[PDB]
Amino acid sequence: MDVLYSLSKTLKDARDKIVEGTLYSNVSDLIQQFNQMIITMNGNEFQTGGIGNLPIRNWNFNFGLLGTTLLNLDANYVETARNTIDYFVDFVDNVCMDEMVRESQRNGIAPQSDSLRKLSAIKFKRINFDNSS
Amino acid sequence: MDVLYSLSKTLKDARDKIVEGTLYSNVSDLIQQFNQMIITMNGNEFQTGGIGNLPIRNWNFNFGLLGTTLLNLDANYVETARNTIDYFVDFVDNVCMDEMVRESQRNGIAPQSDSLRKLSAIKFKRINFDNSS
Amino acid sequence: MDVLYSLSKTLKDARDKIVEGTLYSNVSDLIQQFNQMIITMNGNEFQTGGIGNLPIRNWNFNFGLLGTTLLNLDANYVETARNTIDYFVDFVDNVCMDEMVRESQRNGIAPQSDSLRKLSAIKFKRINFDNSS
Amino acid sequence: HQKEVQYEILQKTIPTFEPKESILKKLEDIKPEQAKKQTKLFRIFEPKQLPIYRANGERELRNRWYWKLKRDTLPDGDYDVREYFLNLYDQVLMEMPDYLLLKDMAVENKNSRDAGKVVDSETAAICDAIFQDEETEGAVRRFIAEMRQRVQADRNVVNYPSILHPIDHAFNEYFLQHQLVEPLNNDIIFNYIPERIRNDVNYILNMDRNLPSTARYIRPNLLQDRLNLHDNFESLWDTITTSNYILARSVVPDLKELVSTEAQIQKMSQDLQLEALTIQSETQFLTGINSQAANDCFKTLIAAMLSQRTMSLDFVTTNYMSLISGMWLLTVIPNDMFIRESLVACQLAIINTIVYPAFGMQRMHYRNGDPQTPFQIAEQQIQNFQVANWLHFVNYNQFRQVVIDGVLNQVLNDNIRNGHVVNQLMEALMQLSRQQFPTMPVDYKRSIQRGILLLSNRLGQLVDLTRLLSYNYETLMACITMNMQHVQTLTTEKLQLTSVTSLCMLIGNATVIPSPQTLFHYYNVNVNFHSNYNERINDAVAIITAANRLNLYQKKMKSIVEDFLKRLQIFDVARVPDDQMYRLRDRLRLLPVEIRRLDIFNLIAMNMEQIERASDKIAQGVIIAYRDMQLERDEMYGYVNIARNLDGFQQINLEELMRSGDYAQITNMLLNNQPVALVGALPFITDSSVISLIAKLDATVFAQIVKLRKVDTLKPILYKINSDSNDFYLVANYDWIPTSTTKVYKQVPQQFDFRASMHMLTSNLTFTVYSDLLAFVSADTVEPINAVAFDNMRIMNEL
């Protein structure tokens, strides 16, 4: 739950700060967060949906790290990062719709979907980012 | 007045950014601000309240610096910082209630409480942080 | 258009973060953006206004870089930066009023003023900053 | 003899030095860094007089002061120019000071009305020439006889005036504000010794020296890993653990007051008879040495566990006395420490001829593959309480992974930290010393049942031996700084079980503990290597990051990594394989840069353009418009064809033209007379002649490009004509406007402003920097007969 907010915070900032022509020192600490997302998420596999007419999708993460060697970001560096952000932002939509749709009566404050129960391990806790909302 | 906002800005960010499992480079510039709060505030002593039914409390600051040597923050590093934040955030409540309750007729734009007059020295000006509200 | 937002974002942050007495590590990445604004903008010249009663003004940029060598910012460093910000913030007002006043019927999504057409070159794309609004 | 050939192929890919015991000198020569202190102010520019000319005229009777780059060693070509700023960047890195004291530099002002001083020797030579010449204004000449220092003996803050360029002040204010030196007291030294020694009763420590407010030090970097060396750098982690092995071997204490081996071999040779059936009959006994096996096993077991270097077992499976004493080796020391293939071969040899025979069971076959060790199979196979209590400890006997203070270390149970597990090894070994051993010949049966009672009758001396072994391992691991990462080492330090039988049958009741002069020395050479390891990473990730932002694509970063591993001083760098040489490279360029080494790269990269354009060797481009543009006026050069921007011309990069090789446009634009601006960093030629200007010289030097197909010989002319260096009368006497075809793109200098180039620098008065913090610590030790372990109960209860 705390790591589901931390996935969405640094995908929002990745579409805002990684723009064409910007200086590298503006994004020098976001890329260290975004590379450290990817290392934690590789090799895992997930499954969302199944209730109602919500379709079943399978998720699989095998991506490469971002480069940390430019002075000003160019259009190669932006377009190779947009096709990684667009796969994560599709994953977070289907986890959030899987959780808003389920409910329990004994302890409703616990996660109910299969994907959000799996994200609550100590393996995934290093993705944690600031909690400012 | 400018340093009263600067105390509250980096206590709000300290509860949001210093979380368990986060990378150290996310909080590498906040800790340099938070350690430099503590160095300025040690050795001083304050007194709030006294008007109406607002009780009189005495404040005294003798704290130690935070560590700057981890790669990912752990539960020792969070729990040793929460028992420092919780003393400052209790101090700022009683200075803000001491100032909203007092008033003057000659020059009302000046600070009126005893603690906020003492924070307006040039000794305390190094706590100043961004003014974005 | 994207670089007109990027001029206003780092002039808003320059009046907020460059304050007296603050630590240098709080503003260590803004000054690298603000110096890199100035290098791109020097030598150019602009012209705004002309329609209605909006007066014609000519703009010319010849400024010097900011210092990157203090530990805490002092009143010399603030007052030498305020007389550079106040010329840029007067320039952005007269470009924004020049664009809100003009319109076209063929393709209205393109820039219409003379200054905003000139800012849409690839020379000015390195001023680009985060797009978070 | 293939065995020495196949081992040598594996050895050539490992950077361990070949005399193995020469590594100990290389670790003890790593010194902590000396605190630097400079004696000059880091000046790049200097003010120099220079003649000026009038509009359409000659030299007037005065001069001007300009800012000139001293020592112009700027090369040509855009690749070589910004490669010169990488050697300048490293020249700032190796000579930045750790601290500054401005009183040691101050020189007396000779023009001052009262006793006034300036900051060093050159700012007194500059301000004296300002005082003399007839051009400076009255408010400046009156001032430099009245500017004052402020000493302020208390609080240790001084102020001295200085005359510096704005670039040169930027490097000097960064050195004054940001310096590594911080105050020392008795509290920091008390929080510097490790935690077990802070809270031990066997060691006595206090402070016997005052430390003033003047005393200082610097904090050596003590950060962890950053780049993982323990997962994929298999050949590179082997030579790390063999260097901690040789260090920890020379720190453990010697044994004391052993059993006399002449009366010990005598009891052993008669308790088991040596005429039964055996073929060795004297090759069984090699345990007669005491200071060379029992000493050299006690050093082997502790130093291999402090260094986390794996062990392998050497034995002869017909010798059972060497095999009974291996039952004590496995019940005390965890089975992670051994090679799996050598662990099983020693476990199966205990069981084949001892465990199963002890109960008449059939000997087992292992089919070398399972996750189950032979102790793990023989455990649910035997229903005996006394033995299976012991077989259950010995296989789930392993380390425990948990941190103290930021250091992950490997520790063991309670029952090995006292000698309590040996009370079960007694019972289990004693239990089978009565097993009637069915089908066994009674000759060989009585020799092996009595050989076990050689060991089971020594209960009180082995309970105290594992009580001492655990304490010396516990005390010496307080002085570890890196993590105790556990992984199977490629090569292996070898153990002989003859040395274990020599340890078991010869120990006395004498307690040995590490003295504090040995505990402190072992702590110093762990911090000195660990601080060296972090300062070299932060030097290597800075040059890789600098040469990438600076666009040096021919840099070949393998030479940075080869210079990286030389300065750790434990590597034979010519033996490291090529995949780990490249995997180490792409882990360096994914690390953030230290902010001290990053605040200076920004400080140089924002000033590259100004240093380059005051050079007096290079001009950064030409234009050619094939039309008679006129000759510019200048108070520096007289008449000059100087250019100040590149507007309306095609900019053609000379470097990208050089690298591509295909010209195809420079040929066309030159044959058919096209206007063009060649952006580069060429060197130029000055020219003072009107006859050489009329003769159209400047347009005749570009046909070299199309024939030679090279750019490196490009060299245009700068017309500097005036009324004193040549025969000027063609300009002055006739009516003609001076025109030319080409311009040489070049910047004019800036002149000396006094108010913009005088500052007031602030530092400390005096202090002292102390390295080697542990010399302020007095260290004593309780008498070794009274020494106790963690439970406040005395070790060596055998007395």
Automatic annotation (TrEMBL), chains A, B, C:
Residues 62-73 are annotated as: Interaction with the inner capsid protein VP2. It comes from the Viruses. Keywords: Calcium, Capsid protein, Intermediate capsid protein, Metal-binding, Ubl conjugation, Virion, Zinc. It is found in: Virion. One of its GO terms (cellular component) is viral envelope. GO terms for biological process: fusion of virus membrane with host plasma membrane. Signal peptide: none annotated. Its main location: virion. The keyword Nucleus does not apply. GO terms for molecular function: host cell surface receptor binding; metal ion binding; structural molecule activity. Sumoylated with SUMO1 and SUMO2. Sumoylation of viral proteins seems to have a positive role on viral replication. The N-terminus is blocked. The VP6 trimer contains a zinc ion located at the center of the molecule. The zinc ion is not essential for either trimerization or transcription activity of the DLP. Zinc-depleted VP6 has an increased sensitivity to proteases. Homotrimer. Interacts with the inner capsid protein VP2. Interacts with the outer capsid glycoprotein VP7. Interacts with the outer capsid protein VP5*. Intermediate capsid protein that self assembles to form an icosahedral capsid with a T=13 symmetry, which consists of 230 trimers of VP6, with channels at each of its five-fold vertices. This capsid constitutes the middle concentric layer of the viral mature particle. The innermost VP2 capsid and the intermediate VP6 capsid remain intact following cell entry to protect the dsRNA from degradation and to prevent unfavorable antiviral responses in the host cell during all the replication cycle of the virus. Belongs to the rotavirus VP6 family. This is Intermediate capsid protein VP6. It comes from Rotavirus A. The gene is VP6. The chain holds residues 1 to 133 of 397 of the full protein.
UniProtKB/TrEMBL annotation, chain D:
This is Inner capsid protein VP2. Sumoylated with SUMO1 and SUMO2. Sumoylation of viral proteins seems to have a positive role on viral replication. GO terms for cellular component: T=2 icosahedral viral capsid; viral inner capsid; viral nucleocapsid. Coiled coil: none annotated. Keywords: Capsid protein, Inner capsid protein, Repeat, RNA-binding, T=2 icosahedral capsid protein, Ubl conjugation, Virion. Signal peptide: none annotated. The N-terminus binds RNA. It is necessary for encapsidation of VP1 and VP3. The N-termini of 10 VP2 molecules form a cylindrical hub underneath each 5-fold axis of the inner capsid. Homodecamer; each decamer is made up of two conformers of VP2, called VP2A and VP2B. Interacts with a VP1-VP3 complex. Interacts with the intermediate capsid protein VP6. Interacts with NSP5. Interacts (via N-terminus) with NSP2. The lineage of its organism: Viruses, Riboviria, Orthornavirae, Duplornaviricota, Resentoviricetes. The gene is VP2. Residues 313-333, 341-361 are annotated as: Hydrophobic. It is found in: Virion.
